[PDB]
Structure formats: C-alpha cells, structure tokens
Design a protein around this ligand. Sequence first.
Ligand SMILES: Nc1ncnc2c1ncn2[C@@H]1O[C@H](COP(=O)(O)OP(=O)(O)OP(=O)(O)O)[C@@H](O)[C@H]1O
Ligand SMILES: Nc1ncnc2c1ncn2[C@@H]1O[C@H](COP(=O)(O)OP(=O)(O)O)[C@@H](O)[C@H]1O
Ligand SMILES: [Mg+2]
Ligand SMILES: [Mg+2]
Lengths: 48, 463, 463, 514
Amino acid sequence: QSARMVAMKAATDNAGQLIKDLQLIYNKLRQAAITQEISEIVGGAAAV
Amino acid sequence: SSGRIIQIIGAVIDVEFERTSVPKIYDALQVDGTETTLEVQQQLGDGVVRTIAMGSTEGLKRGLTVTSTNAPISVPVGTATLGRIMDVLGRPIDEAGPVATEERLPIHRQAPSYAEQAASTDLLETGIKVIDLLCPFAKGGKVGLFGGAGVGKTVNMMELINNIAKAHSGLSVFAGVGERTREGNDFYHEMKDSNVLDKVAMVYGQMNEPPGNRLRVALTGLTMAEYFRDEKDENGKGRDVLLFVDNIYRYTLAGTEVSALLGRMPSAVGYQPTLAEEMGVLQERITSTKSGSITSIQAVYVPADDLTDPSPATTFAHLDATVVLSRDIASSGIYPAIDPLDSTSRQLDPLVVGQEHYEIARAVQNVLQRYKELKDIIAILGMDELAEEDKLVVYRARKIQRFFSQPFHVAEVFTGAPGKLVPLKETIRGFKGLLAGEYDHIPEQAFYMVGGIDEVIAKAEKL
Amino acid sequence: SSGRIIQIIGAVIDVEFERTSVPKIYDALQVDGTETTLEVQQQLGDGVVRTIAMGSTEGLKRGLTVTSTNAPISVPVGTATLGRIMDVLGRPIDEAGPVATEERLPIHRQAPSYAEQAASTDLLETGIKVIDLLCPFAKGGKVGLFGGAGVGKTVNMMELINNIAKAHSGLSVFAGVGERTREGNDFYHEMKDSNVLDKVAMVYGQMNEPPGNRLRVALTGLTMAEYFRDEKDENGKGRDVLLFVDNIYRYTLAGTEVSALLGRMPSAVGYQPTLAEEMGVLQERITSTKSGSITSIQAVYVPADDLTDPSPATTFAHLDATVVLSRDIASSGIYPAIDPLDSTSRQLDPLVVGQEHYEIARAVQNVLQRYKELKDIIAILGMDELAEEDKLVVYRARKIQRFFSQPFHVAEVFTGAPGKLVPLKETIRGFKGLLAGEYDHIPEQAFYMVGGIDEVIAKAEKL
Amino acid sequence: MQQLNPSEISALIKQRIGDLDTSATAKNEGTIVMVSDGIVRIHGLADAMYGEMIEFDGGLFGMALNLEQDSVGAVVLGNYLSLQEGQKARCTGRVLEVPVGPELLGRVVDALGNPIDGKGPIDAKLTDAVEKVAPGVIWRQSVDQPVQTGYKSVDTMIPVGRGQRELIIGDRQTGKTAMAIDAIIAQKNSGIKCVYVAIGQKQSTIANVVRKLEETGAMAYTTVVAAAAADPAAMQYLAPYSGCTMGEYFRDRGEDALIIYDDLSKQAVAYRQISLLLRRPPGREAYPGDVFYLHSRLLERASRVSAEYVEKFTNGAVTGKTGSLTALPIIETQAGDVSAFVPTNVISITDGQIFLETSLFNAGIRPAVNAGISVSRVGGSAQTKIIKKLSGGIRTALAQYRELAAFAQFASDLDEATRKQLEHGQRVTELMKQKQYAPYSIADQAVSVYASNEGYMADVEVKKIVDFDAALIAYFRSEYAPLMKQIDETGDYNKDIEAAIKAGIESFKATQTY
Ligand SMILES: Nc1ncnc2c1ncn2[C@@H]1O[C@H](COP(=O)(O)OP(=O)(O)OP(=O)(O)O)[C@@H](O)[C@H]1O
Ligand SMILES: Nc1ncnc2c1ncn2[C@@H]1O[C@H](COP(=O)(O)OP(=O)(O)O)[C@@H](O)[C@H]1O
Ligand SMILES: [Mg+2]
Ligand SMILES: [Mg+2]
C-alpha cells in the first residue's frame, strides 16, 4: 500500500511537469501560427 | 453593340464597350470567334468590364470581337432532360444527340420568400435500419456524407436512389461537383443497368473545366430541380426531389480560387470572402415549399480532417444531418460502415420520431458507449474477471453492431444484393427486444447480414 | 561611355546609361571616384538598370559617374593563387604582393552536362566512430554538417581538416563565408604552422563585409576548384580536390537581404523566391566529373535549429553525405553531438559496406529507436515497472551513446584530454561486442569520452 | 493613383508624338522592354496568344502568359543571360509540340526532347502539342486490369490497376524512387511501356538511376525526361506535361503505359515562384489558388478509356484493344504533416494513397509502408481472384494487431486469446519486409501468405521467418517450377491448386525442415 502511494505520487509529479511543458508548447505554437497568418494577410493586402 | 478583348489574365477576361450600352451582370457574352461564352462580373466603367470565360481560354487575342446577349444563361429543362448528360451550358455531352425541349430558364434567380416557405416538417426515411434509427430525416432535408476511405460511398448513394426510384416518381438528380471521372462513368453504367435515366439527368464538373463552369453546375442542377419540383403535375402538386452533390467543398474551393483574381482579398483563413452569401443563397434555394419538397444530399470530405476551418462550420450552419463513416467498421464486414457515435441528425427528437423511437435510440447508444468504456477492462483483464453484469451489455452491443447489417440491394455482391428497407416499426421492435435481452441468448451472427426479426430468428435456426 | 547614380537604397544601386550603351547583365562597373565596383542584376530599361555594390556604400552621392568594363567578374586563376589570402575580388589581403599569374576566369558559368558526371565510389576512413560507422563517404561527394548555432559546425570541420588534410596529398581550397574573423585568422595561423598552407589557398568573405560582397563570395573558390579539377596534370588529369563550404546559409541569408530591395516578392517565410534555383545553380557547378575528382565539405547552419525550414529541406536534395547535430546531445555534454538517426549516407550499401558493417549498423539504430520510443513511458513511469529485456536494452543503448563519446585532437583545447583516432575495425568489434552483451556487467561510466574498446576495458578495470 | 506602366519609354512616347499608325508592324513582332530573372516584358505583338510560342533575335524561344493593356510578360525557355533590351521577338503561330513515338525506348532527352544521352539525334516522325484536354467520360471503361508492384502489403493491401490514381508520400530517403523503379522493374515481364520524369534534382541522381536501369536492362523499353535543379524553372514547370503527352501517345494506340513523377511539390514551388514573377495575386502560402486546377487538369489525363475512342483515334485501324494509362505522383512530407496544403489538395484527387513511416525504415523496413492509413479506394477489383481472396484474412489480422496494440506495452496482463492474436499479428508484421530490386512473383507472396494463414509460420521463430520464406521460395523453385509457372501465368485459384500448394508446403517441411 505504501509503495503504491509513492508510485502514484510520482505519477502525479510527472503529469504536472508535463502539464507545464504543454502550456508552454501551446503558447509558443499559437504565437507562431498567429504571426504566420498575419504575415500572409499583410502580403496579400499589398497586392491590390 | 459588341466589345473587344482588352486584357486576358488566367481566367480573368476584360473587354471594352460603348458607354451607350453595357451588358449587365450574369448575362451571356458570346465570343464572336468561337463558341466559348462569358458572363459579366464587374462593370468597370467606360465600357470596361471584368469577366470570366465559360470554356477553354485558348484562341483569344486582345481586341477580338465578342457579342453580348443582354440576358443570363437559360438552359433547357423538361422531361426531355431525363437520361441526358449535358455541359454546364445545357448542351448534350453524352453523345445522346441534340436536346428535345426548348423550355430553358435563366440560371440565376432570387431567394424564396419567408411566407411562401413550407410551414411544417414531415419525416424523411430510408428504410435502412442504421440510418433511420440514428439519422432520420425530414422531407426537404440536407445531409452531409463525410470522408469515405474504406468503401465507395457511391454504393450508398446508389442504394438511396434505388430507394427513391422504387419508392416514387419524386425525382432525383446527382450533379458531378468535382467528381473524379471513374465514379461518374461507372455510376452511369449501373444507372443505365437499373435504367433509372428516366428519372435522372446528369452534369459533370470535371476539375478540368474552367472554375466558373464547375462553380455554376451547382446553380444548373439547382434550377433544374427547382423547376421540376415546382412543375406541378395533374394535381397542382409538386414532387419530392432529391439532389446529390459530389462535394460542395469543391465548389467552395473553386470560388475561393476565383475570388482573388477579381482583385478581391481572400477571407481571413484565405477562402473566398463571399462564401457565406453564395452558400446560403444555395441553401435557401434548397427548401421544401407549399409546392413540393426540395431536399439534397451532399457528399462532403473534410479537408485535413479539421472541422475548425470555415467550410465545415458553414455546412453545419446548414447540415440537417451529419453522417460519418469508418473504414474499420467497414472492415468489420459491415455494409453501412456508419458511425453510430459521431453521426447525428438534427431531427432526432421524441416528437419528430416519437418518444419511443427517440428513447430506443437513446438505449442503443447507451449500450454502445457502455461497451466502448468496457473495452479497456475487456482488453486488460480479459472477459472472465468481469462479472456477468455488463456482459449482457457486451453481448447486446455486439449483436446490435451485427444487427446493423442491411444487405444492400447493391453491395459488392455477397448476399444476392437484396433491398431490405425493413419498416421502421419492425426495426424498433427488434432493437428494443434486443436491448431488453429477449434474444441475448442468441448469437450475434444471427443478427449478421440479416434484416428483420424474422430474418434474425430464421438465421439463428440456420446457424 | 559611362553611367550616373540616380538613387541609393541600402546596398543596391541604379544607374542611367546611354541608349547606345547598355551593359550586359553581369559586368564590373567601376565607381569613377572610388575603388567601389558594381554588378548588374536587373535590366530596368529605358537607359536605366539596377546594380549592387561591393564594398562600402558610403562616400556615394547621386549623379556621380561610373564606367563599364564590358567584361563580367573574371578573377585571377591558377596555382599562383595558393598559400595566399584573397578578397571577394580575388585580390591579396595577406599583403604578400600581387598574384603572379595573369589568367582570369569569370565567376559565372553554366552547370556541367549530364554526360559528364562521375561515379564517386571511393570510401574513406576518418577515425570518428559515428561518422565512419553511419556515414560511409564517396571520395568526391558532398558533405554537409547540418547543425544549429553553436553545435560545433566549425569544430567538426577543423578536426576533419586535420584528419582529412593529413590523410590526403594534393589540392585543397578554403573560402571563409560570413563568419567570425577571429576563428578564421586562428585557422590561418594554424595552417601556417602546418605546411600544406602552401598546398591550399585562403579567401575570406566575412560577416563584416557588405551583403553585396557577401553574396558572390563562393563563386570565387568554387570556380578555383573547378579549374583545378579541369587543370589536368601532364600525362594525366586533375587531382583530388578538397573543398570546404562555410555556412552557405550565409549566402542564402544575403539573398534574403537583397530580394525586397530588388523589387522582388517575399517567399512563404520571406526568402527570395529564386532561392531554390540559385541554390541548385550553385550546387551543380560542384561535382567530380569524368575529369578530376572534387571533394566538398559543407558547413550547414540550421536557423532556429529547425529542419522544416525551406532552406535545409532544399539542402537535403543536394547532399549525398548528410550529417546532423543536436542541441540536446550537447546538453548531455557529449562532444561531438551528432544524431545517429537523421544523418545518413547513400553509400550505406551492403554490396559496398560489407555485410557485417551493414547489419551491425542496422541493429544499433534499431536499439536506439526502441530506447527513444520508451523514453516517454520511462519518464512517466518508474524504470523498475518495466520488462527486464526492456531495461537491458535501455542500458545497452545508453552504453552505446557513451561509447560514441570521443575526444578529438583539437577538442583538447577546452578539455585537455588527448584526442583519439579509432580505426574502424576497433569500432566494429567493440559495437558488436556490446550488442553481444559481453559487457552487461560493466559500469556505464566505463564508456564515456573514450576511443576503442580496449580503452573501455582499461577504464572499467581502472574503475 | 496609377503607377508607371512597362510601356512609358520616351522612345515610344516620341514615336507616338510622331505617329499613331503602323501598329507594331501589325503586331508581327514586339520589342524588349523589361528584363529580369528569366522574365521579360515586351511591347507589341498583341496578335499573339497566351501560350503562343515566341522566337527571339537571339534565336531563342520563350512563352508569354500575360497580355496586359499594352505590355506582355514572357518567360525564357533556355538561358536568358544572353539577352538585352531593344531586341525583338515574333509569334510562331503555334504552341509547344514535342516529338511523339516509340522511338525512345531506352532513350533520355530534354524537356524539349533534346538528346542528353549524347547518342545522336533522336529519330522522330510525330509531334504533339503539349497542352491537351482530357477525353470525355463517354469514352471511359471500368478499371479492372491488374498492376503488380512485387511488394507484400502493396500488391495485397493496396490494389493497383491500369489507369488509376495513386500517391506515395513520405520524407527524404524513404524509398520514394525505390518503389517507383521497382514497379519499372516489375514491368520487365509485363511487357508494357513506362516513362519517368525528372524533377529538379541533381544530375548525378539521374545518372545513377539510369545506370541501375541498364543494370536491369529496363532502359530498353523506357524513356525518361531530365529536368535538373539548375535548369530554368520553365522547363522544370513544363516537362511533366510532355511526359503525359508521351504516354497518351501510346494510350491512344491502346497499349498499357505508366508515367512516374518525382515530387511534383518541387514543380509546384517553381510554378509559384514563376507566377509570383507575373505579379499575380499570392494566396495561402503565397501560392495562387489556381495551383489545384493546374495540377488536376494535368492529372486527369490519365485514365482507362473505351475501345470506341481507340478505333476512332485509329480511324478504326485497331479496335480489339482498349487504351489505358496509369501514373504515380510523388509528394514529400514535411515532418509527416498531412494537413499540409499541397498534399491535402493532392488527396482530393487520387484513387488512393500510400504512406511510409521513418520509424519503420530506421527499424530496418524498406519500404516501411504505413498500412494503418494507406488505402486504395479502387479495391481488389483489379486484383487477381486468388490474391483478393487471401487478402481479407491478412487485412483483419493487421486490423486486430493495430487495434490491441494500445496495451501491447505489456503482454503480461492480458488473456491468452490476446496473446495468440499478438503472436499471429506480429508474425504477419514479419514476412512484410523486402529487399530492393527483387521482383517478387505473385506465386511467391501468395504461397507465403497462405502458409501464414495455415499456421505454418505460427510454428517457427519470428527471428528466422524471413529465412523461412526465402528457403520456401528457393525450395519451390527447385521442385515446383512448373507449378509457379502456372501460378504467375493465371492469377485464378482452384482447389487442386490449394492441395498441391499445401502438399508443396508439407514437402518443404518434410523435404528440408525449415
Ligand atoms: N527494399 C529496400 N531494401 C533496402 N534498401 C532499400 C530498399 N528500397 C530502397 N532502399 C534504399 O533506400 C535508399 C534511399 O532511398 P532512394 O534513394 O532509393 O529514394 P528516395 O526515397 O526518394 O530518397 P532521396 O531521393 O531523398 O535520396 C536507397 O539508397 C535504396 O538503396
Ligand atoms: N569536439 C568537441 N567536443 C567537446 N566540446 C566541443 C567540441 N567542439 C566544440 N566544443 C565546444 O562547442 C563550441 C561550439 O563549437 P563550434 O563548432 O564552433 O560551433 P558553431 O556551429 O557555432 O560554429 C566550441 O566553441 C567548443 O567550446
Ligand atoms: Mg557556427
Ligand atoms: Mg528520390
């Protein structure tokens, strides 16, 4: 029982650290995508 | 009088005219050298106009004479249209000789008024157990047929048109909207085998015709069906006509491409900025009235399997029902391959289908999602350590999935190709009996490749 | 005849010319005031064209006079250019007097014909375990060091030059392209310590230089090598040509720098659209032909350490020998930090590499692949809660990683440990012995930062 | 405010001040105006066509695609470096026609059909315009005529037949060209025609490919066009159309043919660059939207057609045969991002697709086809009766394997039917690898998979099953050579067939004890 609690606590810790990882990933990827379509728009508007 | 070419850019055509007389939008423009034709897009002042060519671009030099028509395109409609395959210009392309009737009507028209709309909602049914159970429809509906990667959806649409033809003279026509040719060719072949041409006419957008042609074949078929339903016969009564679209997404993409060259910025995502207007124009022009019912089925393929781009959302803004499939269940030896968990019909209500039908659907879906939530324990622990609780549910889910089997009257030929179309009453009776566990003592194979409870029980006696 | 300056933007210039005299697209244009020179790029027409400058853009006003040479950029060529340090103009920077020979050659030329390529089928042993194992070389091939900023693109090259230089005997050329001056000068002095200094020639086009200078910098050295390959030995042919590229990414970057000022459009990221064709033009004049053999090494900086960037992607279409670096491997302190997986070689042929080489390599990659896959779960779960064979393979792969870690003969500069040169036989035997598990009882530390397997034995028994 | 036009040279202006007549010598020849990057603007020749060929004072050729109000933009075909303004050009009254005919089997030439082998001028008697419309649906025929690839999964899980549309997509160094030329290898006995299109690569690649073909002697019924990377983007943009014209030549003679592409993606990028230079509006990813239309209109040329069109082309000279022609486009993945615009467009077109995975090839698989996703919407209707019959069992075995693979990380907790499915599926995963340049007969993979279904692999260690199979093959080669002769002859299936096969399978076990 004790060792199961320890292992599950460790699983919780791993999940939390990965969670932080995923927020950072989402933030950067969203920024990059947004900037990308902005670039497309500004390129397009320059045409006509 | 007449105009001359002043600029050619891809599909964009520009012609000068006398300011005394300038053709108006959507009117026909006859090339005086060839049979290629044009329509009006933007009146550019001083006799200048931006236009698009209905046919190949080759053969055209600046300052070349082109005559006007002062009228949009009127393409022929009538009984003579049946069994005829013609261009976007309403001219026979199937080598079936010249058309017969002169009843031709301008392609572009208005939107139906609010008052004139049909004020009710009558159930539309297929006779197929899985569909009518999960996606019942309303006479005048519009259903999306998503994806397609395990078997030909065309088989299913042919089944539907079998249902319609054997059902009524409520007409139906499919239009090739970005169809890859083999579909249309073979399709045609089984059509003339079934000899259903006396109920259908045909047009192809072939990904090769000018984008305007492939963009306006939609309006072409729309107008044809519009008349044909609105053609009241012997009763002051119109039929219930169904139309089929190879892919509206092809139309959307075509319009998206063409929009920019008009000097128009694209949508935010890059699509045509005018997708919604034209799309909804189509949709409201697809509506049952007090004069017959207008309904359509649209085989849609989601780009990149993402539903967040504007096009699928716009479809949902009109999708009366959503039918998705899976290659896996098709590989499960299942004819429909219908998604019983992510295909829905808006008209799925204890009123429109009745409370009993609604709740039976509820019960079936609950059994199925219980099975899927069971699959984890099923795989991990096996089948034994789980007590008989929910094991009857597993049996029910499996025998329901196998019960989903309707031998199609055209099915790649495994069961003699029969048309089941068992009445919904028998279907619901059998399904509720299965949910109850009345025949939970009978193998799923008894439900496999069979229709009614008579069929299931006779199969169980056989196996 | 002469021209006059009419506009100045950045580093791109435009000039007025007499209707009679419009120089060809590639000519030297001397500033009639200074030493500054110009190359034509665009025929802007109407007696006016566009050009760039080589050297400082300052001290330049409008209306000032410029002549034409009626000759493109043709630079001194021949062995009298060896052991010398030239500018982008091929002029001495070492201040060792003007070059001796008088032969000139235009920097521009078409690619050699298809009927002239050669089958570079000659291997090479270097002494670096990962390289000679995973990337067999063809004497005459293209060798690129895919890597980010500070991954060891220069170091990996210096050590190879050491080994390659000492293992070779004949022609060799270097061309500094847009890099730190300090490293270049240090390399020059190191070469001066050697004596093949004579055998080689120096030219530096560095980051400090204006982008106009930064652009057509490789042309010089590549043309040099092309000559020397075509420069046939009496009663013989050209010699083995040693070529070394220093961040062609700099050339790409300059092309990006100039495109907008060129009236050009912005690629999907912002590059010049013409980047692909210019890269191909560049690469195609680089080949070992029926005449002579040309061995080329490429420094490949990777922007933001991304592969999916257009430029690396195009680059793979050019490199038979691909070597890629990683940041995380260096983050682990492993020097060098070359990734086993992506770096590949078309010389990896069982009929070429010998059966055992091929199969041992394949097994190694397989082991690493499973280890990388299981990294996720082992990060999530406890390492202990896994199958025993899984854990065994994990330790195997980790010891493999360590066994790759090698000291290099120039790397002792930041460490002090003496570099190694490991014969391929030792490598093969040691890796096979590891894959045999002959060492599962051996601490993993015994493999870190080592050379041959005997060194591993000594380290382990020491430990 | 309007900006400058490429027509405002004071020379022209003064001419207009002088006179307003003699319009460009009746537009018979223009004059150079703007020159940059293979793109030239010219004044005059308003009579010419979009797509009309143009001669030049340099004795060169080019293709204008922009008929402005008063100017025309044109692209070079060869090297434009030898040009200057003030020169002139003339309309040829014609569009590109490339030589057509079966005089090039074992011959490689340029995008304009020019001898690059250096084996003398190519003999030619017939030419066709490069741009041609697709035939009419009235002229088609249902596709059921088989095609072979010699691959375990492919020739079984992904049927290929004459006239279809199939994509192979993957990353660099995955076997893209390995499979294509392998099919070319597969045609050695099929006795049909096939042609390859080079697309913007290094010549050395082409030379090595050609050398391997000659090693196989495949470049005896074969023709290939070269579009090197250094080549002008014009040729690199056009050549595939010329190849399709080549193929259609034979299809209009009612013979079986194949055309193969090398990453049309490069071609698309080049075209985007070009069209950009036309000052044309850039859409998503800067591509003009028409790119889909441009590709599709090229790809629909491939088909299987009615015999009726055959005789009408021959004027009834030949009628017993039917025209067909198949193709394989090639697209690269970018980190396998299938949602990428261009390949997404491609998918909307083909009859199916083939996916490869790098984590399979590095695992030693070649080609490591991703069977999980790759499909052939045509179906086994173009596959032989026997192979189509055997297909379903393997299909469902792999289905089960991939389905239960979620918990495959530990086989210690499941029931034992799961273990049986695991072992059978992993064994079927085995037997899938294949060496390159090895034209596996239908008999080969047929008996292999049959023995698989007969547990005859379910009784031998998976590590050796490859040697198992190779032995089985050679064993049969020694003994049952007439049997496999019949097998690869027919493609049907019978019960004496199965008995002798099974008897033969027993014999190998009895004769050699694998
Ligand atoms: N069945 C096979 N067995 C072993 N090796 C194979 C097999 N098929 C292909 N290969 C190898 O794959 C290597 C790389 O693939 P290949 O060069 O044939 O074409 P590709 O996938 O288009 O890659 P690229 O053009 O980028 O180099 C080749 O050197 C070839 O020997
Ligand atoms: N062979 C090596 N082994 C260990 N550390 C090294 C090695 N080479 C370089 N380092 C360190 O890594 C740094 C980066 O090397 P370098 O080749 O100059 O990178 P860049 O790609 O930016 O030119 C070096 O300055 C040195 O400190
Ligand atoms: Mg660096
Ligand atoms: Mg390739």
